[PDB]
Every structure is written in C-alpha cells, then in structure tokens.
Design a protein around this ligand. Structure first.
Ligand code: TD2
Ligand code: BR
Length: 138
C-alpha cells in the first residue's frame, strides 16, 4: 500500500536509460500533482500539473537550487483528469528527462542540475492515490 506523500528512494540516483513508472488515480476535484526529483534540499526536476491556476490547467516544470526556483517551463497539454487513472513515465536521458502520460509523449525537461547520480529521491505529492511506483533500466 502506497500512501501520498511518498518518497521513492533512488539508491543509485538517476542515470541514462532509467525509466520511472508511476501508476495511480487522480483524486476527485484535484488541484495539483507534484513529482520532485530531489538532491537533498534541492529539486533537480519539479513536475507540477495544476488543475486550476487562474481557471487554467497547466503543467509547470522547474528546478529549485539554493532555495531559489529558476525559470518555469509551462505546458498546456494536460492529460490528467479528476477521478481518472494515470500512468506517468519518466525516461532519464543524458541531456533531459522525457515525460509521457498514458503511453503518450508529454514533455522534455533539459537537465539543469547535471550531477544525476546525486538525485537520491523521488517525492510524489498531491491529489492522487498511488497504485505503484517503480524504476527499471531499459
Ligand atoms: O516554479 C514552480 C514553483 O511555483 C511556485 S508558484 C509561482 O510563484 C511565483 C512567485 O514569484 C510566480 O508567481 C510563478 N508564476 C506564475 C505565473 C503566471 C504568469 C501568467 C499567467 C499565469 F496564470 C501564471 N508566472 N510566474 C508561480 O508559478 C510554487 O509555490 C512552488 N511550490 C509550491 C509548493 C508546495 C505547495 C503546497 C504543498 C507543498 F508541499 C509544496 N512547492 N513548491 C513551485 O511550484
Ligand atoms: Br516532495
């Protein structure tokens, strides 16, 4: 039984060819979801679907370094729905993270924090129920 917030440990951090698969369901009347690829107090990759930001559904991605957020990357393609099952897949490549939702490519996020093997945890928070959270080398 996975409960949210959930911290998925990453003993070897992240590396090219690592695929992270997160399966769950969006809670009814969801407000937001967050995936945080963490390196201590820093967030190498923050993936944040917002269901109601000024009456708009938008995905915000960013990096938090030295308690400061960088430039936001915004994506209006929004494959999540309240009360509906989801599958988020994050493929780690040498230059970026590739995110897909329900087997459909969603976005690419270029690495800002290049020490990938230092990302020791994946935090999964927000208005979701979690079925599984796993990683594999593909
Ligand atoms: O970058 C991502 C960060 O975003 C800020 S919100 C951010 O605030 C900034 C303040 O300067 C700007 O307002 C920024 N913004 C909006 C627009 C804009 C411009 C035009 C139209 C339009 F619509 C919008 N432009 N710039 C906002 O997105 C969240 O707090 C932060 N976060 C939140 C939490 C957090 C929250 C709850 C629980 C928890 F555990 C953690 N943990 N990290 C994280 O998600
Ligand atoms: Br977190």
């Amino acid at each position: 039984p996975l409960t949210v917030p959930y911290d998925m440990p990453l003993p070897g951090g992240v590396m090219p060819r690592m695929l992270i698969t997160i399966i769950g369901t969006v809670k009814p009347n969801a407000n937001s979801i967050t995936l945080n690829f963490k390196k201590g107090n820093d967030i190498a990759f923050h993936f944040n679907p917002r269901f109601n930001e000024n009456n708009r559904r938008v995905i915000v991605c960013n990096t938090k370094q030295d308690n400061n957020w960088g430039r936001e990357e915004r994506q209006s393609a929004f494959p999540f729905e309240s009360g509906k099952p989801f599958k988020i897949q994050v493929l780690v490549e040498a230059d970026h993270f590739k995110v897909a939702v329900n087997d459909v490519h969603l976005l690419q996020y270029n690495h800002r924090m290049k020490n990938l093997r230092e990302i020791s945890q994946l935090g999964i928070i927000g208005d979701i129920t979690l079925t599984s959270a796993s990683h594999a080398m593909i």
